[PDB]
Symmetry: none
Subunit: 97 residues, 4 copies
């Protein structure tokens, strides 16, 4: 064969919950974000005030995108968020309407 052939496994899990992501607001305590999103995987020193999440995004039975989310804290409350998951959840809810 002139063209190669490979087998790739895409890990399933942590499907994006748009309502949970679109629920984050500045001023929420760390405990609030835990109740909304669950604990992140990393919990070292550098990630005490920076929590990383990664979600799977599926459409029509296919995993299409890994959507990342970062939550920043100061004095135990949420100060800002960034990542693809924010837009991913916003447009997912707007498409559901």
């Amino acid at each position: 064969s002139l063209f190669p052939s490979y087998k790739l496994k895409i890990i399933q899990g942590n499907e994006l919950e748009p309502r949970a992501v679109a629920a984050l607001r500045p001023g929420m305590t760390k405990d609030q974000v835990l109740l909304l999103l669950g604990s992140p995987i990393l919990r070292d020193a550098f990630h005490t005030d920076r929590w990383d999440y990664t979600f799977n995004t599926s459409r029509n039975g296919i995993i299409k995108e890994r959507s990342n989310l970062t939550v920043y804290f100061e004095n135990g409350v949420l100060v800002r968020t960034e990542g693809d998951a924010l837009q991913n959840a916003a447009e997912a809810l707007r498409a559901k309407q």
Copy 2:
């Protein structure tokens, strides 16, 4: 740059524990090598992240019986360390398959 005009790709979507794959991990493996062996973890950019985390399922009769976690660490682009109970659960499943060959 030289590129294949086309290639074929079979995708598996799941998180079932693959004992033989986990048991084949070796120090010095590249990130490309680990990806083809264990699968693409739930990371936006695995190529440029030095720690990957997996959560595997062990199911029998269609029921998840236990969950196994695996963490792989990379330094200078090669594998150097592993953590998580997926390592021991994989070794126990391989040895259980051996004991069953001997009845």
Copy 3:
């Protein structure tokens, strides 16, 4: 969430102009639909970018004869506008194929 346990994927790597594909663009197409028709543009995250830019090549006898640019715009997740000389170059190639059928 319901997922296919596995699916097959044939990948084409190139930037050759595909006249029929360009000529099949319609208003209202989703981003998933445009991706399967024209290809995945050189964008990190096309799903969440509202403008995509393509640069196509027209080659004959293995020599790039001209380059065609295409820009697609999305609003509310569907296609609404196109720019670039790939549109006219694709229409001219399709009509040239027709004229050749008539000798």
Copy 4:
């Protein structure tokens, strides 16, 4: 067939030039970045001081990653850079050594 089958085209072009990306330094004029990287595609008002680039990253004949680069300017000189391409070029040169 129980499993679907799809055809996907991955667009070739704009291959990452690690030396060019690793050459960017604060204080370079816009003209310098043009000579190093060429012009970006977007050139509207919002992108007068923010230039976006995207590159293909290939290994062993396969396109593996689309690597993005953003260059920020103030008073016509480069102030900072961000994107995957920076790490992508750094580790590509370190692996070439």
